[PDB]
Design a protein around this ligand. Structure first.
Ligand SMILES: *[C@@H]1O[C@H](CO)[C@@H](O[C@@H]2O[C@H](CO)[C@@H](O[C@@H]3O[C@H](CO[C@H]4O[C@H](CO[C@H]5O[C@H](CO)[C@@H](O)[C@H](O)[C@@H]5O[C@H]5O[C@H](CO)[C@@H](O)[C@H](O)[C@@H]5O)[C@@H](O)[C@H](O[C@H]5O[C@H](CO)[C@@H](O)[C@H](O)[C@@H]5O)[C@@H]4O)[C@@H](O)[C@H](O[C@H]4O[C@H](CO)[C@@H](O)[C@H](O)[C@@H]4O[C@H]4O[C@H](CO)[C@@H](O)[C@H](O)[C@@H]4O[C@H]4O[C@H](CO)[C@@H](O)[C@H](O)[C@@H]4O)[C@@H]3O)[C@H](O)[C@H]2NC(C)=O)[C@H](O)[C@H]1NC(C)=O
Ligand SMILES: *[C@@H]1O[C@H](CO)[C@@H](O[C@@H]2O[C@H](CO)[C@@H](O[C@@H]3O[C@H](CO[C@H]4O[C@H](CO[C@H]5O[C@H](CO)[C@@H](O)[C@H](O)[C@@H]5O[C@H]5O[C@H](CO)[C@@H](O)[C@H](O)[C@@H]5O)[C@@H](O)[C@H](O[C@H]5O[C@H](CO)[C@@H](O)[C@H](O)[C@@H]5O)[C@@H]4O)[C@@H](O)[C@H](O[C@H]4O[C@H](CO)[C@@H](O)[C@H](O)[C@@H]4O[C@H]4O[C@H](CO)[C@@H](O)[C@H](O)[C@@H]4O[C@H]4O[C@H](CO)[C@@H](O)[C@H](O)[C@@H]4O)[C@@H]3O)[C@H](O)[C@H]2NC(C)=O)[C@H](O)[C@H]1NC(C)=O
Ligand SMILES: *[C@@H]1O[C@H](CO)[C@@H](O[C@@H]2O[C@H](CO)[C@@H](O[C@@H]3O[C@H](CO[C@H]4O[C@H](CO)[C@@H](O)[C@H](O[C@H]5O[C@H](CO)[C@@H](O)[C@H](O)[C@@H]5O)[C@@H]4O)[C@@H](O)[C@H](O[C@H]4O[C@H](CO)[C@@H](O)[C@H](O)[C@@H]4O)[C@@H]3O)[C@H](O)[C@H]2NC(C)=O)[C@H](O)[C@H]1NC(C)=O
Ligand SMILES: *[C@@H]1O[C@H](CO)[C@@H](O[C@@H]2O[C@H](CO)[C@@H](O[C@@H]3O[C@H](CO[C@H]4O[C@H](CO)[C@@H](O)[C@H](O[C@H]5O[C@H](CO)[C@@H](O)[C@H](O)[C@@H]5O)[C@@H]4O)[C@@H](O)[C@H](O[C@H]4O[C@H](CO)[C@@H](O)[C@H](O)[C@@H]4O)[C@@H]3O)[C@H](O)[C@H]2NC(C)=O)[C@H](O)[C@H]1NC(C)=O
Ligand SMILES: *[C@@H]1O[C@H](CO)[C@@H](O[C@@H]2O[C@H](CO)[C@@H](O)[C@H](O)[C@H]2NC(C)=O)[C@H](O)[C@H]1NC(C)=O
Ligand SMILES: *[C@@H]1O[C@H](CO)[C@@H](O[C@@H]2O[C@H](CO)[C@@H](O)[C@H](O)[C@H]2NC(C)=O)[C@H](O)[C@H]1NC(C)=O
Ligand SMILES: *[C@@H]1O[C@H](CO)[C@@H](O)[C@H](O)[C@H]1NC(C)=O
Ligand SMILES: *[C@@H]1O[C@H](CO)[C@@H](O)[C@H](O)[C@H]1NC(C)=O
Ligand SMILES: *[C@@H]1O[C@H](CO)[C@@H](O)[C@H](O)[C@H]1NC(C)=O
Ligand SMILES: *[C@@H]1O[C@H](CO)[C@@H](O)[C@H](O)[C@H]1NC(C)=O
Ligand SMILES: *[C@@H]1O[C@H](CO)[C@@H](O)[C@H](O)[C@H]1NC(C)=O
Ligand SMILES: *[C@@H]1O[C@H](CO)[C@@H](O)[C@H](O)[C@H]1NC(C)=O
Ligand SMILES: *[C@@H]1O[C@H](CO)[C@@H](O)[C@H](O)[C@H]1NC(C)=O
Ligand SMILES: *[C@@H]1O[C@H](CO)[C@@H](O)[C@H](O)[C@H]1NC(C)=O
Ligand SMILES: *[C@@H]1O[C@H](CO)[C@@H](O)[C@H](O)[C@H]1NC(C)=O
Ligand SMILES: *[C@@H]1O[C@H](CO)[C@@H](O)[C@H](O)[C@H]1NC(C)=O
Ligand SMILES: *[C@@H]1O[C@H](CO)[C@@H](O)[C@H](O)[C@H]1NC(C)=O
Ligand SMILES: *[C@@H]1O[C@H](CO)[C@@H](O)[C@H](O)[C@H]1NC(C)=O
Ligand SMILES: OC[C@H]1O[C@](O)(CO)[C@@H](O)[C@@H]1O
Ligand SMILES: OC[C@H]1O[C@](O)(CO)[C@@H](O)[C@@H]1O
Ligand SMILES: O=C1C=CC(=O)C=C1
Ligand SMILES: O=C1C=CC(=O)C=C1
Lengths: 624, 624
């Protein structure tokens, strides 16, 4: 096993455990100290204003199992500190018959048991568990724990009658899944249900959704309401909030609803951020965010989606969320988005970026798997003065349109996503910033033009505004993690409305994924404009490439170039001519970003372990 | 619910939880503070000379489940103190995927991990578990824990490869069971295997048996040897030590070998107690003690048995224990005998006495189930100068015979059992002792003659020597827990060789068992004697009646008379005449015995709880 990054890679499968720990590892984002991580969980803003982030964790292993909550905190979403207790960075782990198979996703009641922050989480026990298996009642239940020390530790309620687990009966038969309880307050739903509380007797100020589906009949999001304010044991099933068909698709802009939902949440947003009104704010929009499974041929069969919904009250005192329009939260190798409230009327979302090593060929040599996305502010994105000649505008697929009185302009409404400003300020302030001269890409443009300033390592951000003719057939974008022999190409092709990441040359290491990523991006043409603009921001962080377009479209992916000098970046141009010119302006390189984990040394591996022969006997976990 | 014990009992099923807690409860023996208990476990003499006793425990429930080790200690086997820690009187509980279904029986390595006392115990996980079910590998494994505080707490080894569980592979296919590891040192087995250690590479100074059987093909006791001295992870399977047939019986004196063994142990005894020789002591005998299941129509389908064995070395470096003769450790409602070494060359045995409420009609009103037997010294019982005209003497069923050179007398050898002298001394010293005049039972004897001194409560011992003609057809014994309308009759009938406990009138409460108990007792006639003698000792302790005959035969049973004055005792006589006279001498009543738990108040109930609806979903425990 040679680690010489100035020559072709050898047979890296001969390398020892965690020998590639630093080679591809993100440094500027949320990631576990070592081992396996997946979904964010237990997200809340603590009383001191700091952010508590949990995550599905399996230390000293590179596959899922014994799943636990790992945790850390931050004052700015950007620089983090691990908790350190009797179980290291874990704060909740399998310990009782009701959760011994895994502490799955959960969400926070800020003022819960005895007034303490409280998690409602999926407690799993024995039996087949999965949307394609024959799951039985009891395998997935919902349980409570509370913290008296601001997340350093959690105390579970006792096992038994009138204690844990608090939710165990399936609300409908033949569920595909029953997990990921999402607790939220909703002046909106309280106002809609206020005339019907005699039917259900549920009058609490918290709601919870549970994610699942019905065998052969599509995904379901189940709505519960806290039975009584200030009491956390009794949750009353109201009815299905979101009902979708078996592998139903709302179309090209909307992924696929698959067979089962995971990690679903409910929020209400306005153009500024989070909306706390009861329905009185005409600028506010109800949103559901949710993962779907088995509706996709790749990306681990997983879509992270969102929908704008209009609530209807049923005669039985329940809510139907009717989908108005439906989009994609991230088009790449990410999933399990969680959103939570933050002071200043913010709703902040974060997800999990998995690796692109689906055959588990170098996972042991890494000694870890997984990272978070960046933390994103959600808001209602409003585009004014949109031209009705914008191609495809009235399909209203993942956006709404509202005509002016005179029918000569349109207001477009969609879900907005942008990186939290604390992270952008910290990244820029800690970086070497190069402001680049604007570039016209014409007949003289090479396929690839390196920027006048170059990154020094695999930790940088790029931004630019690409101005295209209304009838362009030109393509442009950014090349990143680039040497002569390895590079990753990010293209936008306005004629197809496709943003692509081409990874055929991303790495000399052939075991990593090399498939092309694709997002749809609608350039809303403005009345009187003779051009259309893509604002593209790219974060490069070890192996993570995280792309944002127009504060709307996000695409997370992975690239693992071997060579030490595969760090370069610049402009891509295809079919640019004297007549079909792409104007590039607002160009900036941020080299370095931030050390997100300042207390951690470069190598936080503790080694890997095998569960031994009993892993295959129990049949619950891979064992490594 | 009336608790008036001066009138007939009402409908006691209407009484609240633990309202009958003190009514029938033993006071002079080992019993949990409350709730469910079964098998003794983790027995050892600590470094300070005190006795540590564990037991299968389910606090705040009256059925088995979440099975844990409860624990206490004593300097004299008689007066006990509970441990008190973070889990009350528990010291080991289900906590890991490998033991979450129950911490089953285990036994002690006195000098184990890091030199500390160490338990090897059956760690259970999910799946069908039972001799009549289709159990799979992994459901029952064997795991280690050690104590750094003399049994106040136990630290389990970690889960995984080269750690817990340490024994998990089935040594043969289609096991009926795989549990109750019994760790022991054996100079005898070390000497027998010393020429074969090249075949197996196992050279440690500890052996372990595991109890089980093979579907359709009878019980098995599996022998393991510690692979290396001072190392406790690796245990090498040698082979089956005891192999018996499917519901095989050695006859009337020997119960039935059933389909599966439980709680088996291995020892070596001589006439004084425990024998530590390598085979050089010609007076020493190898014994196996073991429970069997599904070979009995009643007593919960359970026989507590013992066998004298002759060891043979197999060519593959394993031991065959060939049964020489085979007996019964207790003929009544007891099971799960454990034996352990005690200073002074002693081997001490203790078991579990279950209730006689098999339909669980008043278990909640009790608020507890179960007690121990008394602690018994085991030894080789030798009877010299036995007459060859002793009926049935040369069947050698549960004893051996050795002729004198001249063939005119016989030495009889069997397993001896007697109550530990510390308990007899403490009971007698704390009691009001009445020494009773000898009585000849003849033509003038009533059916029942009360003793001249009477007990004052349900806590007393009786002793007597019953001298019968060699050709008697008379019956005699003791009546206990007796008023005019409730009583328990203990009869010996030399003509049938049957000791019976008749319980048709034991209680006015009709839901308790009322079936007749039976033991076989051989009166070894002595050369030159014109009579044969039964020495009978009876302990009455709440509802426990524990009978010992001739330091050989034990019979534990239960009686639950309702009336406050059902406490009397005396002599029984049937078919005694001027010619067929039973001489009764050495008569003594010990009234009061000892308060075995001086720190405990009279009512140690903490209430009962229900596990709720998930108990039936998981399907492992009754839930109450
Ligand atoms: C199979 O058997 C299993 C084992 O028995 C069983 O699991 C056990 O279940 C029981 C019952 O549910 C659990 O007991 C609960 O424990 C809760 C506390 O749990 C936390 O703390 C304990 C103990 O911590 C001490 O000891 C440990 C270990 O040594 C130390 O590490 C700690 O530092 C601490 O040490 C101090 O104290 C020791 C003695 O206790 C001293 O010896 C020592 O020197 C120290 O000073 C930990 O063990 C727990 O860890 C375990 O669990 C966590 C998850 O929670 C895991 O992460 C971890 O790995 C472990 O597995 C944990 O950290 C108690 O809060 C709880 O008691 C409350 O509930 C019951 C109701 O059910 C009440 O009776 C009781 O009164 C308490 O309720 C009151 O208090 C709360 C708030 O304080 C109120 O909300 C409530 O209304 C009520 O208020 C009352 O009091 C108020 C004021 O005082 C008053 O105003 C009110 O009006 C009212 O009166 C309960 O005891 C137990 O933890 C489980 N143990 C384990 C090991 O899992 C399992 O379920 C069984 N399974 C089945 C299938 O049956
Ligand atoms: C799913 O996830 C689960 C959770 O992660 C996981 O379970 C956890 O498994 C891990 C790994 O097996 C277990 O970790 C082991 O812990 C052993 C100690 O366990 C006892 O103590 C802990 C910690 O106790 C502290 O904290 C609690 C809770 O707060 C307090 O109550 C205590 O009072 C105590 O508090 C003090 O310390 C705290 C910080 O630690 C302070 O914060 C505090 O202020 C206090 O001062 C308890 O939590 C344990 O309780 C749990 O388990 C018991 C049963 O054991 C239950 O009854 C209970 O309910 C709980 O469930 C328990 O009481 C460690 O001994 C062990 O470390 C040794 O082993 C590893 C090898 O694997 C070595 O790396 C390590 O070095 C240690 O080995 C050395 O030491 C021993 C002897 O000391 C030697 O035999 C050995 O050779 C070696 O020697 C070395 O050192 C020598 C000298 O120093 C030197 O001479 C030698 O040469 C050599 O170097 C290991 O850490 C963990 O306990 C489990 N946790 C739980 C909650 O279950 C589960 O398995 C997962 N499941 C799956 C399917 O994967
Ligand atoms: C005395 O000790 C018992 C523990 O043994 C304490 O708890 C009770 O235990 C018994 C079992 O011994 C439970 O009986 C079972 O009850 C269920 C149906 O239960 C539902 O209806 C009840 C009646 O009003 C109600 O109390 C229950 O409420 C509790 O549980 C829910 C969770 O479901 C929880 O949310 C609440 O907060 C409560 O804690 C519940 O809603 C029944 O299905 C069982 O039937 C089986 O067994 C019976 C009898 O053999 C048989 O007839 C059936 O056919 C079936 O086979 C069983 O009756 C009882 O529910 C428990 N009560 C509780 C927990 O409050 C009891 O509390 C102790 N008493 C005191 C005063 O401390
Ligand atoms: C690096 O990190 C790994 C953890 O990932 C550490 O542990 C090793 O993990 C791997 C899995 O990643 C284990 O591989 C499996 O091994 C078994 C067969 O194992 C037996 O033979 C081994 C070879 O000599 C031997 O080491 C093992 O000994 C350990 O375990 C026993 C318990 O059985 C224990 O008693 C010992 O004390 C040791 O701890 C064991 O006897 C094999 O069956 C598995 O095969 C599956 O997968 C492979 C590969 O995909 C496939 O080919 C098969 O067809 C099948 O599907 C698998 O190979 C390995 O045994 C673990 N080694 C251990 C525990 O020592 C590893 O230690 C870390 N290295 C360092 C230097 O820290
Ligand atoms: C691309 O980014 C530019 C620079 O941020 C955006 O221009 C701003 O847009 C807002 C909202 O209309 C204005 O109020 C600002 O004053 C504009 N600043 C400029 C032109 O520098 C532009 O709108 C973005 N374009 C798209 C299509 O998202
Ligand atoms: C019944 O008990 C008596 C009294 O303990 C036993 O008699 C003793 O037996 C031992 C062993 O042979 C003698 O060494 C004692 O000296 C005897 N004491 C006496 C006669 O008082 C008697 O053996 C017991 N009988 C049976 C059949 O077990
Ligand atoms: C980078 O490294 C490779 C391999 O060492 C080398 O061949 C190449 O010339 C270097 N520079 C660039 C920009 O590719
Ligand atoms: C890489 O080494 C592995 C062992 O990890 C071997 O099985 C595989 O064939 C090797 N690939 C080569 C030589 O191309
Ligand atoms: C990281 O540390 C681990 C654990 O000590 C070690 O096995 C590994 O080789 C180290 N890797 C690197 C790149 O230093
Ligand atoms: C309420 O009605 C809806 C729609 O019919 C149904 O799906 C749901 O189960 C009902 N709620 C109940 C029965 O609580
Ligand atoms: C919205 O405006 C477009 C362009 O003027 C027009 O074709 C369409 O009919 C309008 N829709 C409504 C509801 O007026
Ligand atoms: C660098 O990053 C840290 C950590 O996020 C941040 O607090 C600090 O303000 C940044 N420095 C700048 C912008 O000068
Ligand atoms: C004992 O109590 C019962 C019921 O109170 C009574 O009838 C009887 O006379 C009393 N005495 C005896 C020795 O039975
Ligand atoms: C005793 O009361 C129970 C309720 O615990 C009742 O079901 C049973 O029939 C009663 N027995 C009677 C009245 O004989
Ligand atoms: C024993 O104490 C328990 C628990 O406090 C109580 O429920 C029960 O009624 C008491 N029983 C008696 C006989 O005092
Ligand atoms: C040794 O031989 C016995 C008797 O044939 C057999 O039952 C046992 O499995 C053997 N031991 C092994 C294979 O370790
Ligand atoms: C033992 O003694 C009895 C009675 O004398 C006799 O019948 C029998 O044959 C003897 N057994 C042996 C082995 O001598
Ligand atoms: C009474 O019993 C205690 C506890 O077993 C014992 O230590 C004490 O010696 C006994 N008293 C006597 C025999 O006087
Ligand atoms: O780790 C388990 C968790 O991961 C998810 O499957 C999302 O990928 C959640 O539905 C579940 O709670
Ligand atoms: O509580 C479980 C324990 O009880 C027994 O079944 C004996 O009755 C043992 O075989 C087992 O270890
Ligand atoms: O929080 C931390 C985690 C790991 C480490 O090694 C240092 C700090
Ligand atoms: O050890 C003890 C158990 C219970 C109780 O109440 C008092 C002492």
């Amino acid at each position: 096993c040679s680690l010489d990054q100035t020559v072709a890679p050898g047979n890296l499968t001969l390398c020892g455990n965690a020998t590639l720990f630093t080679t591809f590892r993100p440094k500027a984002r949320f990631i576990a100290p070592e081992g396996w991580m997946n979904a964010p969980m237990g997200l809340y803003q603590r009383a001191d204003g700091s952010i508590h982030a949990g995550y599905q964790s399996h230390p000293k292993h590179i596959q899922w199992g014994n799943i636990s909550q790992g945790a850390a905190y931050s004052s700015d979403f950007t620089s983090w500190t691990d908790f350190n207790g009797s179980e290291g960075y874990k704060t909740i782990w399998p310990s009782q018959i009701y959760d011994i198979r895994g502490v799955f996703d959960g969400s926070i009641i800020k003022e819960g048991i005895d007034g303490y922050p409280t998690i409602l989480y999926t407690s799993t026990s024995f039996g087949p568990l999965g949307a394609t298996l024959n799951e039985a009642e009891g395998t997935e239940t919902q349980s409570l724990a509370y913290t008296t020390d601001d997340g350093a530790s959690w105390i579970k309620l006792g096992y038994g009658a009138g204690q844990n687990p608090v939710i165990y009966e399936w609300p409908e038969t033949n569920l595909t899944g029953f997990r990921d309880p999402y607790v939220f307050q909703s002046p909106r739903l309280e106002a809609l249900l206020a005339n019907t509380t005699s039917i259900t007797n549920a009058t609490g100020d918290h709601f919870a959704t549970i994610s699942g589906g019905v065998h052969g009949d599509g995904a379901r999001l189940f709505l519960y309401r806290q039975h009584t304010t200030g009491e956390f044991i009794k949750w009353t099933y109201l009815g299905p909030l979101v009902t979708t068909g078996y592998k139903e698709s709302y179309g090209e802009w909307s992924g696929n609803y698959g067979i089962n939902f995971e990690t679903a949440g409910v929020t209400r947003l306005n153009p500024a951020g989070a909306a706390w009104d009861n329905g009185s704010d005409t600028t506010a929009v109800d949103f559901v965010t949710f993962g779907t499974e088995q509706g996709r041929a790749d990306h681990q069969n997983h879509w992270p989606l969102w929908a704008a919904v209009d609530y209807e009250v049923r005669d039985n005192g329940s809510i139907e969320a009717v989908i108005a329009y439906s989009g994609v939260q991230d088009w790449g190798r990410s999933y399990a988005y969680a959103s939570f409230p933050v002071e200043g009327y913010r709703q902040v979302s974060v997800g999990w970026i998995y690796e692109d090593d689906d055959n588990v060929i170098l996972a042991k040599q890494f000694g870890y798997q997984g990272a978070f996305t960046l933390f994103r502010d959600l808001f209602v994105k409003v585009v004014e003065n949109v031209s009705p000649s914008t191609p495809g505008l009235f399909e209203q697929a993942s956006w709404s349109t509202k005509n002016s009185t005179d029918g000569m302009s349109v207001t477009v409404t969609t879900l907005g996503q942008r990186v939290v400003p604390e992270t952008l300020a910290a990244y820029k302030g800690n970086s070497t910033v190069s402001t680049l001269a604007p570039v016209m890409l014409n007949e003289s443009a090479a396929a690839y033009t390196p920027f006048s300033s170059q990154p020094t390592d695999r930790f940088y951000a790029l931004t630019g505004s690409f101005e295209f003719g209304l009838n362009t057939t030109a393509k442009a974008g950014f090349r990143v993690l680039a040497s002569e022999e390895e590079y990753t190409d990010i293209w936008f092709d306005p004629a197809s409305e496709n943003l692509t990441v081409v990874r055929t040359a991303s790495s000399l290491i052939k075991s990593f994924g090399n498939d092309t990523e694709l997002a749809k991006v609608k350039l809303y043409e403005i009345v009187g404009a003779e051009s259309k603009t893509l604002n593209l921001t790219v974060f490069v962080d070890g192996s993570v490439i995280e792309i944002y377009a127009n504060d709307e479209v996000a695409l997370s992916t992975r690239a693992y170039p071997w060579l030490a000098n595969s760090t370069g970046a610049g402009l891509l141009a295809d079919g640019t001519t004297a007549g079909d010119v792409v104007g590039v302006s607002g160009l900036e390189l941020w080299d370095g970003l931030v050390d997100a984990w300042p207390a951690r040394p470069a190598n936080t591996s503790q080694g890997l372990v095998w569960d031994g022969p009993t892993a295959a006997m129990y049949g619950l976990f891979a064992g490594y």
